[PDB]
Amino acid sequence: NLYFQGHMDNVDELRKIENKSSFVSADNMPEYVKGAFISMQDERFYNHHGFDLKGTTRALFSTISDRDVQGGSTITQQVVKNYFYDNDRSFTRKVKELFVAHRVEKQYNKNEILSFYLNNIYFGDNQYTLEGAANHYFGTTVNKNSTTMSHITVLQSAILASKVNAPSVYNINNMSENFTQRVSTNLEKMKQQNYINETQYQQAMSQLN
Amino acid sequence: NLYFQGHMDNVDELRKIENKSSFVSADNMPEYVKGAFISMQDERFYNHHGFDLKGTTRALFSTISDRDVQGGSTITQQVVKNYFYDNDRSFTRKVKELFVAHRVEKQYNKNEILSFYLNNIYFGDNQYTLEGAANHYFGTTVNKNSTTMSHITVLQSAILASKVNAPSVYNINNMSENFTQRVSTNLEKMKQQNYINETQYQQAMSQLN
Amino acid sequence: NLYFQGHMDNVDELRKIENKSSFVSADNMPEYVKGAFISMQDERFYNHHGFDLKGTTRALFSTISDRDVQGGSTITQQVVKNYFYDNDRSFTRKVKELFVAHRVEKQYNKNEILSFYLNNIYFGDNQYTLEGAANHYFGTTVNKNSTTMSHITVLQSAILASKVNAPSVYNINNMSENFTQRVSTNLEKMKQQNYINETQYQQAMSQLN
Incomplete structure (x- = not known):
């Protein structure tokens, strides 16, 4: 997949994903398909601006329960990390991914990001x-x-x-x-x-069982 | 082990561990058994309130040596993480575990936690x-x-x-x-x-050799 | 390799690496050999004092690109981590390694560290x-x-x-x-x-291909 990875000199490098042969736009997917990913990775995807600071903070401090706690990466952060060439995971790379996520959210709408x-x-x-x-x-x-x-x-x-x-x-x-x-x-x-x-x-659940 | 895991709506969910068939209370264990775990995981277990901020800070700043540095999780934090369903490790889940650890320490004595x-x-x-x-x-x-x-x-x-x-x-x-x-x-x-x-x-040491 | 590991009661414990039979001093290596490691691990090795705060911050905030972002450990930090006995990776051990790295940089010149x-x-x-x-x-x-x-x-x-x-x-x-x-x-x-x-x-590149 190296061709569809890069250094992100400009966020418009992500547009090249659109030329994949099996590319399917989020717009063209059933909602339950998209919600499978959204629900599991970043429930308030459509609402936040890439970071989900508010909801993360509530899930943490509002209930003793872990019911609302999610994983450590919004879908927008995941798109940055996966566009960047494969590399060792570290705090310094995570932070760069957060910085660039903000640039991705500034440029693109949620359906483009999800695509x-x-x-x-x-x-x-x-x-x-x-x-x-x-x-x-x-x-x-x-x-x-x-x-x-x-x-x-x-x-x-x-x-x-x-x-x-x-x-x-x-x-x-x-x-x-x-x-x-x-x-x-x-x-x-x-x-x-x-x-x-x-x-x-x-x-x-039946099929899975 | 799913039955003895949950979301921790209430810290009294941990009491259900007491019904395991091979349950053995900390009270009923030899000290050297308990100290094997305490010494290796969280030496000041009995003294701190779940976080060990003081001792961690000394081990860090008092000597150049790493002799007093321990692992990143007190036994109370480990109990929370293991009661919560298996999940990917992240900063956001660690932080929730710390929050709940404080609630566990508030409710239970050290022997119950250790059990x-x-x-x-x-x-x-x-x-x-x-x-x-x-x-x-x-x-x-x-x-x-x-x-x-x-x-x-x-x-x-x-x-x-x-x-x-x-x-x-x-x-x-x-x-x-x-x-x-x-x-x-x-x-x-x-x-x-x-x-x-x-x-x-x-x-x-002989037996191990 | 246990003999050449320890607790770092004193930074002069690293001098014992000099008695390895296949020891080769950095001074005695071709530059391109050293630069292979420096370029890949910590480009401003010779310039910083063990932490590379300035350059790390630029690579992060100056360009949107990830072109200048490096891994999370300077060579000096890596020397500390590898001198310390093998252990689980955590925030608390990383922080001790940073503290000791400063002591290593205070005592030794860059060629000794690199060696x-x-x-x-x-x-x-x-x-x-x-x-x-x-x-x-x-x-x-x-x-x-x-x-x-x-x-x-x-x-x-x-x-x-x-x-x-x-x-x-x-x-x-x-x-x-x-x-x-x-x-x-x-x-x-x-x-x-x-x-x-x-x-x-x-x-x-030819040989590699």
């Missing part, structure tokens, strides 16, 4: 786009208009949204109990955030 | 309690009253206290040089902190 | 010195005076400088695409920092 996200992160088996992965893993499609191809299910969406946390380890064919827990949590959060309903939720 | 610790952390091979591990690995017991079962040795205590830092990697049967170094350091610290004496120390 | 670096970090296959590794991996030597032995090439220097980031994983014989990317970047930085020229750069 750069889903079409340039690693899903396993050499797939750096969400359509390549769905096709490869399930032979399904995340284009909501297709009349040609089976549409990605709720479960399969959750599976891919959880998978990108450890794409080389989490194995779709032989799912570990931990990968299974991750996906279960993803589904529940898709339900709580109203991307799916009880029926879908139960159908997906 | 929640030793009976709900992972020791390897599907063992989430210190008695299950001792029984499984050594066929020994950490109940100081048993007249029925061989009592866990000093070495075996150090081995398990070091093991929980990387329970899936550190292998009791075929010990790596690093695991071996960890255990050696544990024994020395058990000696320096007066949980064991020279005799015990040397007997354990 | 402690290259002669006590892990290169793979049981090699804790740069000469042991060059001899073992390539049968070459980093002593610039040798009339006896083939001299380490530009490529081989970059390979070893990148290798110490993950010495047990990066494999010289069967190089992963990532290890390959690391080395490529190292060479380019050796060129940009004027340790090598275009000819050398291209010869090394």
Whole structure:
């Protein structure tokens, strides 16, 4: 995927992701597909400006519970980190990613960011786009208009949204109990955030079981 | 171990650890067993209020030596992290664990905390309690009253206290040089902190060699 | 390598690295050998006092680009971390390493520090010195005076400088695409920092390809 990585001399370098053959715009995806990723990675994605300082602070200080605590990276931060060439993880690189995230949010709307996200992160088996992965893993499609191809299910969406946390380890064919827990949590959060309903939720929990 | 994990709506969720079949109270353990864990994880456990700010600061700024520097998590922090469902490690989750640790210290005494610790952390091979591990690995017991079962040795205590830092990697049967170094350091610290004496120390160093 | 590790009661403990059989002083190495490590780990090594606060801050805030951002550890910090016994990585240990780095910079000149670096970090296959590794991996030597032995090439220097980031994983014989990317970047930085020229750069890129 080196061609679709760089140093970010200008944020318009991300536009080159649009020329991938399996590129699919966020606009062209079903909501529950997008919400699988949003719910699992950065629930207030549409609301914040790349950092989610307010919501992070509430989830921390408002309840004793960890119910609202999320992972350490908003989707916008993840897009920066994945556009930058692969490198060792450190505080100094994280901070640069935060700085650049602000520049990405300044230039692009949430759907463009989300499109750069889903079409340039690693899903396993050499797939750096969400359509390549769905096709490869399930032979399904995340284009909501297709009349040609089976549409990605709720479960399969959750599976891919959880998978990108450890794409080389989490194995779709032989799912570990931990990968299974991750996906279960993803589904529940898709339900709580109203991307799916009880029926879908139960159908997906059944399929997973 | 999912049943004995949760979101901590209330700190009294930890009391459910008490119903594990192999539950053994800290009160019912030999001191050198407890000190194996305390010495290796959080020496001033009994003295601090969950954070060890004072002692951490001295170990840092008082001597050039690293002799008094410890790991990044007090036993109380470890109990929170292990009660929370398995999740990716991040700054935002660490901070929530610190917040909740303060609530745990407010409610419980040190022996209750230590009991929640030793009976709900992972020791390897599907063992989430210190008695299950001792029984499984050594066929020994950490109940100081048993007249029925061989009592866990000093070495075996150090081995398990070091093991929980990387329970899936550190292998009791075929010990790596690093695991071996960890255990050696544990024994020395058990000696320096007066949980064991020279005799015990040397007997354990002999057995390890 | 335990003998050449310790608690740093005094910074003069590092002088014992000088008695290693394959010890080679930085003074006795070709510049491009040293620059392979400097360029890849800490470009302003000679200029800063162990922390590189100024340059780190510029690389962060001056350009949107990540072009000048480096890894999270100056060579002096790396020498401390590697002199200290192997231990779990944490914020509290990192901070102690920073404190001691300042004491190392106070006592020693840059060539002594660089000599402690290259002669006590892990290169793979049981090699804790740069000469042991060059001899073992390539049968070459980093002593610039040798009339006896083939001299380490530009490529081989970059390979070893990148290798110490993950010495047990990066494999010289069967190089992963990532290890390959690391080395490529190292060479380019050796060129940009004027340790090598275009000819050398291209010869090394050819050999690597």
